[PDB]
């Protein structure tokens, strides 16, 4: 259980360095602010007096502060400290700021690996957490059951900016099925059906909604969205009815509105019998 | 068990329906504007009927289901008088308002009414995880309930004729929704060559916890409260616009995105940072 250094001591910087000594690893940590440590100094952590104690009291060093620019501020002056060292960014930011920080550690010999977690502090440790890994294989490799104490590492490649881009990605299927359960929630409210009682109707229809995606995805892939069955035509009739009952029953339309816009946008420039997959292409265009 | 059923409509999905009845048994009797749909069915054993009429009078319970409920009116209306006494199951799809007329109309005709709507695709009846959500008569459903199970697993509402149809559109919400997010997703990673299919098994996996994620958002959907500690509105909202700035920056259109950063905003705008996203349907309803 070798010694690793957590920078920065928020929520999820705290979490990390408990999930370290939950392992029985010697945790170094730091923060710009002393009194934040201290719960984690009575579990057994080593707060340092500086950044560049804490970094060269270990080979692992673990980052999360709150933006990449706060990072490059604290991080830009220990480049020589960090050389010759493993840094792990889990601060969270966009395929170009790990990009920039990629860079950078490579110009120091800094082994670089950026994550992004999906998941919420409480959830540091359980093996429902995933963190999306992106950049140094080696250090992924060499690290691997250091990573997997926040949870199961998915190693996208040695594209830093692959983590952020995969989090993003996901995270706007997370916020469309939530907003549109709402919206479904909000609709069966004008009968007092409630959300709780809507909710296991959803859960089921998720499966559902789930398998379709295969078939949708070989379509996007291959560009042949032709189908006999769910045409985009009689799609968009349904957004535009969905969105007129939820007039009629008494709630705002927004959800229903932008998929209308969007599907029928597809509509008016692709093909009647085309399939959902060729919302793709209306979507890269945009 | 194997009671007399007649089918009206023998398009794609009516004669999988009547196909469904015949194959477990029952005395199907059907009838269809065109009769050479009714081939087959006709052939593995079912009786069909000269006027729509003829096919009423066969049976205690008449399915029907053809293109929309105009049509399925036009059809119905003139047989007022001789479906009286009976069941009418109608899986024709539509609105709520158009289910509800036609459970009016049924009542005022001394009709038994449920109406559904299906779940599935044709050859999906009879199949495991096909599902019919229904409303109306509960009697009807209660005393077909076998019948029904033929063809899925039904779901019975409750009494409000409306509310089939009002879950299923709540539904296909979802769908459209989840469909778009997935394909602006694979849209985003086709930027660095990633395919929708490598795509695919993350979305598969996360879908899994973002099923996870309701129960909880259903509890403060429904309690007002909205208190976290750990994922408010700020973050997500912050984080939609980052989905969308990159989405531009690695060189694709931000529709999804966009209209997902305005909407979780509105409730920002209106509540409190640390609000959950379960808040958001304060927005939706007040609207
Ligand atoms: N919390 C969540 O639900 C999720 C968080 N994330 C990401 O995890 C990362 C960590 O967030 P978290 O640590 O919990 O956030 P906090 O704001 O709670 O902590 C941020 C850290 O940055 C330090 N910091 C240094 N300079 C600054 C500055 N100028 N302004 C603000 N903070 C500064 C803070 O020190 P000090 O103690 O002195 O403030 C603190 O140590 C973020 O990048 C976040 O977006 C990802 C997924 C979900
Ligand atoms: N198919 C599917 O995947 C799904 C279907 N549904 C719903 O099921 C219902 C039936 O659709 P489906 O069977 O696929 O459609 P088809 O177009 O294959 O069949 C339409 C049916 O309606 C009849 N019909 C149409 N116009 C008239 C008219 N003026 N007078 C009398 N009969 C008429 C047709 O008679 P004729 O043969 O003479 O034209 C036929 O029986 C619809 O409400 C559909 O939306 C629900 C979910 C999914
Ligand atoms: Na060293």
């Known amino acids: 259980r070798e010694r690793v250094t957590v920078l920065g001591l928020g929520r999820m910087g705290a979490a990390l360095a408990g999930a370290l000594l939950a392992a029985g690893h010697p945790t170094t940590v730091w923060n710009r602010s002393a009194a934040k440590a201290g719960d984690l100094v009575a579990r057994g952590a080593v707060l340092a007096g500086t950044a560049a104690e804490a970094v060269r009291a270990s080979e692992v060093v673990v980052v999360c502060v709150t933006d990449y620019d706060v990072a490059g501020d604290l991080l830009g002056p220990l480049a020589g400290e960090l050389a010759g060292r493993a840094l792990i960014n889990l601060t969270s930011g966009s395929p170009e700021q790990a990009r920039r920080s990629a860079d950078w550690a490579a110009e ?19 093996p429902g957490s995933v963190l999306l890994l992106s950049g140094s294989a080696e ?4 690290r691997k059951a250091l990573i997997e104490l926040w949870g ?14 995969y989090d993003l990605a996901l995270l706007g299927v997370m916020w469309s099925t939530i907003a549109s359960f ?3 929630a909000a609709l069966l409210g004008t009968e007092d059906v409630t959300a709780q009682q809507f909710l296991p109707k959803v859960e089921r229809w998720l499966g559902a909604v789930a398998s ?10 291959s560009g042949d969205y032709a189908t006999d069955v769910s045409g985009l035509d009689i799609n968009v009739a349904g957004l535009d009815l969905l969105a007129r009952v ?14 209308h816009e969007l599907y ?23």
């Open 108 to 126: 120091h010999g800094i082994d670089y690996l950026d994550g992004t977690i999906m998941a919420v502090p409480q959830g540091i440790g359980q």
């Open 182 to 184: 709402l919206h479904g």
């Open 139 to 142: 250090v992924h490799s060499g």
């Open 152 to 165: 199961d590492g998915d190693y996208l490649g040695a594209d830093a900016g692959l983590s952020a881009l």
């Open 246 to 259: 939820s007039r009629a029953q008494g709630i705002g339309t927004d959800v229903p509105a932008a998929l």
């Open 264 to 286: 029928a946008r597809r509509l008016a420039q692709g093909s009647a019998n085309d399939g959902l997959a060729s919302l793709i292409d209306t979507i890269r265009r945009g």
């Open 212 to 221: 379709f995606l295969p078939g949708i995805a070989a379509q996007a892939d």
